[PDB]
Design a protein around this ligand. Sequence first.
Ligand code: BR
Ligand code: BR
Ligand code: BR
Ligand code: BR
Ligand code: BR
Ligand code: MG
Lengths: 251, 213, 300, 223, 242
Amino acid sequence: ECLPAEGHDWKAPTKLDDPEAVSKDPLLTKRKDLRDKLICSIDPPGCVDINDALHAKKLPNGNWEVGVHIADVTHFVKPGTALDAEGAARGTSVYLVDKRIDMLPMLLGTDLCSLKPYVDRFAFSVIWELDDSANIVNVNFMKSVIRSREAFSYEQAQLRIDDKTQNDELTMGMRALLKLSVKLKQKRLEAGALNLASPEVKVHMDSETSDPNEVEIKKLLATNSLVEEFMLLANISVARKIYDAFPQTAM
Amino acid sequence: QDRRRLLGPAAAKPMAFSNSEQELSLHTGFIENCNGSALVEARSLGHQTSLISAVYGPRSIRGSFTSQGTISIQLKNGLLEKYNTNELKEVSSFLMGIFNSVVNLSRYPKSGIDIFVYLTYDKDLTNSQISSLIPHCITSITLALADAGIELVDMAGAGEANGTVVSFIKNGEEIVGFWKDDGDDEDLLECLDRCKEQYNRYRDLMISCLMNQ
Amino acid sequence: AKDIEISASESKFILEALRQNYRLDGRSFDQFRDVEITFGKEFGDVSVKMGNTKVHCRISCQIAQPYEDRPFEGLFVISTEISPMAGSQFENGNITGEDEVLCSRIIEKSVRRSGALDVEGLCIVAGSKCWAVRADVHFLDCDGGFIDASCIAVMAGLMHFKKPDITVHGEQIIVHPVNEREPVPLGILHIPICVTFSFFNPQDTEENIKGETNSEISIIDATLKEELLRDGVLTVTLNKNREVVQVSKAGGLPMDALTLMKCCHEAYSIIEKITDQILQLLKEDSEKRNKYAAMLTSEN
Amino acid sequence: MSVQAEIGILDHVDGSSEFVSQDTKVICSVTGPIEPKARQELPTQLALEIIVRPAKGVATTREKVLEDKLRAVLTPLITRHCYPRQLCQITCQILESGEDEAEFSLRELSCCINAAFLALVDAGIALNSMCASIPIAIIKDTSDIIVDPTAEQLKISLSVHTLALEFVNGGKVVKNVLLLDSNGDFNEDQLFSLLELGEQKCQELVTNIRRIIQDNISPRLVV
Amino acid sequence: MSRLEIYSPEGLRLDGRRWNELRRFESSINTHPHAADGSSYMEQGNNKIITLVKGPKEPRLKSQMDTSKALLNVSVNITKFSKFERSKSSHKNERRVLEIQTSLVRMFEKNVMLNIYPRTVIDIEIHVLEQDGGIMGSLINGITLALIDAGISMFDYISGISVGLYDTTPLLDTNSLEENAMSTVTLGVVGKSEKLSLLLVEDKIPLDRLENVLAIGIAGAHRVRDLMDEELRKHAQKRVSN
RNA sequence: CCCCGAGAGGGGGUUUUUUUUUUUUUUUUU
Ligand SMILES: [Br-]
Ligand SMILES: [Br-]
Ligand SMILES: [Br-]
Ligand SMILES: [Br-]
Ligand SMILES: [Br-]
Ligand SMILES: [Mg+2]
């Protein structure tokens, strides 16, 4: 019942200054507009619950503009509600080969909050301005509204980067992300980052019969290092900011 | 701790340790600071007492007007044995009633006679104890008042017997104060006789002190 | 005590000026005085200035033992003893007067009771040894606004103060001097700021009790002259988290509830500017001490 | 002896000052002559209300001694017979100790004397003469006499001294020794060597004070 | 975190009341005729308050005398047996109590016509026999009643009330248990008006909830005024009829 | 202004306190 009354036909307002939309959401004026940006999501094949979304542009001053966009779950789950209560209780959603026990309802996690492509979605965006050596010059945090250009798969994203046939603005940004990913991963390891390993097997259930028959191994593509490096970068900047604001109760 | 005294560190804890009928001494007028003073020392059995009395008056009272004088008595704890402030106040009240029957207040209009009794050294050597100190207080105050030159109807003295204290005047004919804690039942007559004997002895020594000294 | 004589002419003039949207210092009714914060050489030394109003706060701490009731919490006290230095109107050591006890209680409910300071982080060894933080406010010069000035002085001091670092070997406390290792800052849960409103009745009492249209005047952060001619006081404490820490309208001129709410919202805009201001002056002070530390090591 | 002082910094007081020596900073205020309380009244002379506030904590018996010694200096300085049955409030707020207050009160006392004098000058109260106070100390091994010692020097001292002299004739003639507070182990030879060097640095201080007073007050007056 | 049902889903509280119900309110006038010019015995819940008004009369010291108005004094005696756990120390000189006394004076200085009683003194003695939340509001009602009994002129009633805020649920007239589990707001409303003589918030309250809490308190205080007025007219009729 | 007297005399106009359901691997996307 704590879910939006609209349901699956919920939609971000076309205009962020519309009288009706502002009347219902007075915080909408603080919402930035990044629907002009080229956002894409790199997640596993059968991923419907998308949390992150990336983009990259080259600023006229030679520096790069990197933006990590995270699902705006806070806008839907409010403290005190039973939805928030159950969310805190579960703590996290468990992942099995069989099923997938969600922390939040399907309508919220696999649709509304999910940064699906081709649709306007609310998001909490973190935008950096960094040089070619991946050094942060400045960082800004802002709640925004985006529209994902395409929801890539890890194998699909890697092929589009390598083929060299597609040189569209999106792919050019994806390669820029990977190039900056190498720089960030380099500096991090030099700083003393660990490189542990435990690539567990993936149960390839026979999609022609019923019972599982094949056991393979998941391979780490360069796109996995792309996403990992920018997720870490996002978490670090946020950690510094929230601790500066709340030095005594920072999660 | 206190901003007016030096009581030392707060984490400090006080040191706790493990396990004739009466002999009198009287002196008067040794305190130049006041109008009258007395030193009363008594030694008997397993308890000795050395207390000092000091009379300040008659001095000014800047409030309304009174045809007679106003007496105040305050007992102070000494160095050794301590007593409850309540208990010292109670004895003070009991002493005020006594000397309001003896002091010729009519001779001191709009004046104040403040009597201080310092329980300087009260040793308890037994290897409500305040009842045994009362007769010595009355003796000190009487000596101090007489030494001060304050008019008295008669030499007020007292005695103590089994927690019962009674002060006499007029050769023991009448009573100016009666005090009784603990004790036994129907022992009034015995106490009156024993205290009158102490009263008589104390009065003789007091007169002997006020004259010869 | 020693009184301040106010003529009928002065009473009528200042009140009539308010009726014409005029206050003597030239401020606005909703205008808070410019707050100047100066840090001394030592940590915990802060000087707050609002116009002519001058207050000085000093934060200090010493090793002490916690109460039996609270073995995990440290000790924290706030002193605000007045002196004739702020004016002969104040009696030396008068800590029971109406205005004194109020001010003392406002600060206490704003900082102590509110839990602005993390007293749990003042504990060294539970039920044995802890830090005892002391905030001493010195009222140098009075031109009104002593509550607001004190609350800023205490908070700026607590956020600027740093206690000596401590390593613990069981019950053996190794107190590192500032020469050995750097001192450690205090834990601040929130930053409470006080804003005081002064009320004036331009008419008579009858029109205040039974009058239809309300006409009572309210000004923010009154000076001494405005403070001596007011009919009611309101002190509201908030923080950047948009929450009311405490509100105290202890009697005085009866005031409309909606007007009191308006004051709380007006005060929130002020406490936001003040809080950010304090933080900036703390950063620059830190940058100044570090730049000198670099120029001292380079020359060394 | 590189002290620094300001005059007339407080608004709601007849006179005020802020004296600073090294790390010792004291602000003082003076109101008077004004109406005295009945218990303060002196039939023929001026009554002095002297208050000393510590840098940390509340006023204790320690500051009560600072008030008493400061009284011994200020009392003969003021022409008290000019103000019969009248009061003069003198308040000192020590802002910074400049010394280990748990061990010493030397620098705070000298700074209070100098500040109180300056505040009396600012307030325009009848003074019989001028005055200056300096703290002196004698070190352990070297046994040298250090005028205006630092906090670190005090820690390793054998004796601590407060010297306040009364000057007349343009700050050249020592009228009297208002206060000499010597504490610790010392001999007669050390005492007079202290008094000889102490008088020199005191005379230098008065000259500096006279400069400060004229620099601040002259712009207020007319030519 | 409270394990007790402060406000059940059934809309019921620990004592049985709903969110907008006052406690048992019983006033009493002229309780101590031989001890004061005016007197009132207040029972608001488990709260028990004796209020004595002595005056207007001659000041005991001519030093403390105003020739333009009467001197108003209030002394609150919170007895050591007011709570469940007996307090060892006295509260006579407690800074919390001095503020309460000061607060009450500042309230009635602008209500009691002190100007028509120059060169006199009005002494208000209060004894709190039992305490159970909202003691400040009960103190206000006790003084207002006692002052009226003394025939001392005032412009209007001053009714006191406390309102708690349990997360989002406002609770009118809080007891000790509720005050320990949430922030409360104490109001002092003048007559039937919207004007507050006393606004007291000592614990944290969101800025958005404060206006609504005030609205609840003012409405509740008006009911307290009606009960005070009702009981007063009743006593008036029983006396004027003889 | 008020009180007093056959004759413009006198008296007053007030001075620190209701806060505690404890357990075995890094990171990223799921
Ligand atoms: Br679901
Ligand atoms: Br699209
Ligand atoms: Br001590
Ligand atoms: Br604790
Ligand atoms: Br002004
Ligand atoms: Mg993702």
